[PDB]
Design a protein around this nucleic acid. Structure first.
Ligand SMILES: [Mg+2]
Lengths: 97, 106, 95, 87, 95, 106, 82, 97
DNA sequence: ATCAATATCCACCTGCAGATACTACCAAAAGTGTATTTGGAAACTGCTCCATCAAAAGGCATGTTCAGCTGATTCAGCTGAACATGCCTTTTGATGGAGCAGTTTCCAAATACACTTTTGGTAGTATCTGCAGGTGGATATTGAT
DNA sequence: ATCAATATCCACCTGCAGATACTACCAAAAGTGTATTTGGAAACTGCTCCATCAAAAGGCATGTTCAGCTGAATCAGCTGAACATGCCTTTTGATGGAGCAGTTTCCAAATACACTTTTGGTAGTATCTGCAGGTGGATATTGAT
């Protein structure tokens, strides 16, 4: 039974996703969270579909960019596995804290 | 009657740029060369990006520039990238980049 | 049925100048339009501040010029200015 | 209106596979199992801030609908400028 | 010779209300003044933007409030609004 | 005659704030209450920072606020620190802080 | 005893900055890296300030030229006007 | 004969310079650097005394804040010695690179 | 553990740098009054586009396996902190003049206004065309051996 | 290196969403021409405050020593990738209807000037004191034993 070595599909995936531009979070699930959070701010709110779509393009962009920063932080610690400390270090320097 | 764009030799609307500088509440008065210069820069920058975007569209064997090609144009260009340093291009993706340490073997 | 203004006809014009065999998705155009809107606000802004700091109630192409040298990086600034200078110069004489 | 379902725990809609892909687009090869909760946390903060600002724009315009332009202005306000979804 | 306005006397008045026996160094007052100018420019900036987005020609106290809510942190935003409303209410209800 | 600042119960000049709002090219028109509100907001904030730097001077056995005090006041308060998160107070130094992994082992 | 101007930002000076920054141990290579960094900071800030000076048609770079440049680089500074 | 251990004075200095607010570059050698840098932008310039001060205040503040992030980076890699890569990592995540 | 060297703390002292109170002024706000211009709430109704639901299409969760990564341990060797002072670079104050800033001035270019032409959007109906995503079918890449 | 399992890469291929085309009109631009105001360059000029330097100050470049920190090397445990398996959830196309936004009518409020009053900023004067340094003498920290 044939198997790929750990890390080989991963770099396959990276080659693939850096190529494509499609959003990576499922639409509806992301729509729900937007709605749940907004509700907590204010009730009976409605969302132009392109508002949600703005918010997803925005967030994914933000999260992806953050993963690069995160990934650089890991490599600094002479690792290849990103950890919450790497996210945390990235965000502190960024002035998000 | 000859339009002010053609007067200044621009495809971009000098009329409109003049008008938008007024409602925009930037100053009390808007000089005559202000919108001409502004239109000229605005025209220049968009020409600069479309030249580059067009290439990324050709490299990709496509005829139509999509947001990926815009993103590829800006990001691969030092001076454009800095200008749009804090700007996100919807549906543009990222530049292919894998850090060396992640590649296999040695 | 209110009218929505954009630089789309102008962008396209300039698109055919550079690549006459190349079209543009309405989305790329949608971005190309934001880009001109964005850069407008930014140069206008600096010009706006620039005048205030000099007790000037007028933005002349000179303010647009320092605004451009402040805003745009290195070689982009250098070329924009030239085109601005060129267009203003070709405007002054043509009436 | 007759009955509108309760929204809760939707953050778990941001699945492990979805987060992974994002990290892959980020160029991430290996992901510690604690990341997905941490990313979810971070995304929650992100949205909360953009939405608070967006909604504020909505309410100032006395609307009940959060417009695409509401979000676009909230984004430029926080220095996360977005092209492609309006003015 | 020319007049150079400041917030200094009004900052100083407020200091005396808050800490009657405490003074302020020149440099600290120059920072205080800078701060007041900064926040004014920010809030007016936002108030300006709100008006535009809604196609309104007036900057009203409603604008200034939404501007405050967008710029200031929670407790600081809340208290500011209460002080902002309180002052607008007192001023109105006085012949 | 009676000042709009005394009418609002404020120390901060409503008239000046109104003046500066007009000549500031922010919109075509300035509403009557807007400068009152704004003056209040600015005043309040001025009081908040002088309060904390007042205490910051007291803590350090002092009676005159120097820049240092204003810096201790801002950076030690979570909300003021966020508002001034991208501002530098001249001659303010930094908060006493050493990373606990740099401390000598006991 | 000719010496570079940037080298005027001495090791003990750079160390004191590092100290206020709470740095305990400093690699020797830092002092050259830091000097490089300071050069980029100043070029960027000065370029913009001088650009304000030229617009005002002046030969003297004024504190406001600097303060404004600082504000526009996003490095707002209090205590010198504005 | 008497000698303090490495890192003991360092700590003593950290504690000292965080108490004070006086600038830590000598005025003159700085001022020349300022002028030398400006000469590439315009010849025969003059500098307001307060203007060089504004520039110093800002440069020092900047650098001191940069060392903080640099130091958080060195610690992240499980070190206590700030190295050029730490400054570089701090800067890239900030956006400066 | 003690022991001595020296860093650090604090109470008291005081000249003077930098804060503060005090006066007569005048240009310039800020306020008061009346004439005018308008911006936006209000109330009404077209109609876009949002919530919501039903069918249909595809990525999600989950358990198992073990590859190789992380993190601990150890260790050697390199590399940066500590040290003392006269050398030389900066700081301090003294004095010439550059140029910024305040003043008056006048015209080239700003605004205002008013009919007169142009044109950029849309709107309704049309045809054109680039390419997404299906197909197979020839060419790598990877990892077992 | 060689064999085989499967990813990858084109290349053409037919449907069709999205782009392109033009025809009709039309409100709102942009234009043009002229009467009317003025912003700011220009030119002169006074007096800060800036470049310079002489003497006074006091920080740092130096080169030796070894404490201890970095980075290599080694390895045990177990975490996270790969993948198979079984199906739930999202996606996608379709239909009444909330609220947004287009237009119109109407006034409380905001702007424009003028005239009356005042306030804040300077300035020139002397008037005042908080606290930076210096001191002395107790006590804590560090490093050695
Ligand atoms: Mg809830």
């Amino acid at each position: 039974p044939h198997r790929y070595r750990p890390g080989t599909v991963a770099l396959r995936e990276i080659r693939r996703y850096q190529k494509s531009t499609e959003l990576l979070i499922r639409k509806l699930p992301f729509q729900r969270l937007v709605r749940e959070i907004a509700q907590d701010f204010k009730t009976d709110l409605r969302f132009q579909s392109s508002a949600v779509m703005a918010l997803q393009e925005a967030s994914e962009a933000y999260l992806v960019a953050l993963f690069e920063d995160t990934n650089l932080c890991a490599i600094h610690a002479k690792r290849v596995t990103i950890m919450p400390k790497d996210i945390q270090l990235a965000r502190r320097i960024r002035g998000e804290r | 009657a000859k339009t002010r764009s053609s007067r200044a030799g621009l495809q971009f609307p000098v009329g409109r740029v003049h008008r938008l500088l007024r409602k925009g509440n930037y100053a009390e008065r808007v000089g005559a060369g202000a919108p001409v210069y502004l239109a000229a820069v605005l025209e220049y920058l968009t020409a600069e990006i479309l030249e580059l975007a067009g290439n990324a569209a050709r490299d990709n064997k496509k005829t139509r520039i999509i947001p990926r090609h815009l993103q590829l144009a800006v990001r691969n260009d030092e001076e454009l990238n800095k200008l749009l340093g804090r700007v996100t291009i919807a549906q543009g993706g990222v530049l292919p980049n894998i850090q060396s340490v992640l590649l296999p073997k040695k | 049925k209110t009218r929505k203004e954009s630089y789309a006809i102008y962008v396209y014009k300039v698109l055919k100048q550079v690549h006459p065999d190349t079209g543009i998705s309405s989305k790329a155009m949608s971005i190309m339009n934001s880009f001109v809107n964005d850069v407008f606000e930014r140069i206008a802004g600096e010009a706006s501040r620039l005048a205030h700091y000099n007790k000037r109630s007028t933005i002349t192409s000179r303010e647009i010029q320092t605004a451009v040298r402040l805003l745009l990086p290195g070689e982009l600034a250098k070329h924009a200015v030239s085109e601005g200078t060129k267009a203003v110069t070709k405007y002054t004489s043509a009436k | 209106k007759r009955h509108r379902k309760v929204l809760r725990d939707n953050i778990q809609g941001i699945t492990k596979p979805a987060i992974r892909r994002l990290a892959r687009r980020g160029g991430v090869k290996r992901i510690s199992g604690l990341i997905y909760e941490e990313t979810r946390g971070v995304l929650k903060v992100f949205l909360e801030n953009v939405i608070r600002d967006a909604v504020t724009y909505t309410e100032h315009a006395k609307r009940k609908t959060v417009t695409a332009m509401d979000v676009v202005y909230a984004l430029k306000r926080q220095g996360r400028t977005l092209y492609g979804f309006g003015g």
